[PDB]
Design a protein around this nucleic acid. Structure first.
Length: 147
RNA sequence: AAGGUCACGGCGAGACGAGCCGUUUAUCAUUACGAUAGGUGUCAAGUGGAAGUGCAGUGAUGUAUGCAGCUGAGGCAUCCUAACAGACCCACAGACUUGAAC
C-alpha cells in the first residue's frame, strides 16, 4: 500500500562509544557516519533524523597509514587573499585533536540543512573518559575487518 | 521585581542609533566617594597697556593713575539657574529524558 514514513522520534536514541586508540581514520569515520544517518534501521529515511548519537574517545590517538601523519594537510582559507592556511595533520593532532574526526565525519555525512543538524550527534573527546552516561552508551559495532 | 528604556543636565562620545557620566536637601565630619551643563568668584593663559581725569605739547601725539582693560570652551570654589514631572518595557520559578548521593 503506502511505504511507512518515519513518524516522530525524539530521544532515547542509542549512544555509542568508539575508543579510537589506533583505529585508522577513514574507515572508522565511515562506520561512524553510517550510525549517524541511521542506515542500520529498517526505519531508515533520508528526510528524517532517525540516527543515533555517538561518542569518540581518545581522539588524540587516531592512526593514519602511509606517510599521512606528516602529509595530510587541513586547510582553512580566510575569505581574503593570502588567507590560505597550510596545516599538517601532525600539527592538528598535537594542537587541537578533536577537529580531526570532526572533519572526517563532516565530510562523510550529507551536508544540507539536515546534515548540518545531525553533525551534532557526534561528541568528540580527547581525554580517555567521556562525561556522557546518557543512555549508558553501548559500545559501537564495527563491521570492518581492517582497522 | 533584578535590570532596563524614555525623559531631564551634558561630554575629551558621537553622522543617527551607540557609548560614558549625571538627575538636588546635589552631605556633615576627624585623610579619598554626592558639583552634570550654565552663571558667578577667583587663578593659570592670551593680548598688551583700557576709560576718565591730570600733566607736557600750538597740534599730531606722549605721559601718570596701571603687567591696568577688555578677554576667562582650561583649573578649583559656588547649588544662583536647570537636571521637575513623569511615563514605559521587565514577571510568578524556568516543558521532555535517564544518571548520582542522602
Amino acid at each position: 500500500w503506502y511505504p511507512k514514513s518515519a513518524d516522530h522520534v525524539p530521544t532515547d536514541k542509542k549512544w555509542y562509544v568508539v575508543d579510537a586508540t589506533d583505529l585508522i581514520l577513514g574507515r572508522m569515520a565511515s562506520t561512524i557516519a553510517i550510525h549517524i544517518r541511521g542506515k542500520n534501521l529498517a526505519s531508515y529515511t533520508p528526510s528524517v533524523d532517525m540516527g543515533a548519537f555517538v561518542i569518540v574517545v581518545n581522539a588524540d590517538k587516531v592512526a593514519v597509514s602511509g606517510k599521512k601523519r606528516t602529509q595530510k594537510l587541513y586547510r582553512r582559507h580566510s575569505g581574503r587573499p593570502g588567507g590560505l592556511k597550510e596545516e599538517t595533520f601532525d600539527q592538528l593532532q598535537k594542537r587541537i585533536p578533536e577537529r580531526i574526526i570532526e572533519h572526517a565525519v563532516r565530510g562523510m555525512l550529507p551536508k544540507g540543512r539536515l546534515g548540518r543538524y545531525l553533525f551534532n550527534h557526534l561528541k568528540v573527546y580527547k581525554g580517555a573518559e567521556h562525561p556522557h552516561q546518557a543512555q549508558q552508551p553501548i559500545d559501537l559495532p564495527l563491521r570492518d575487518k581492517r582497522i
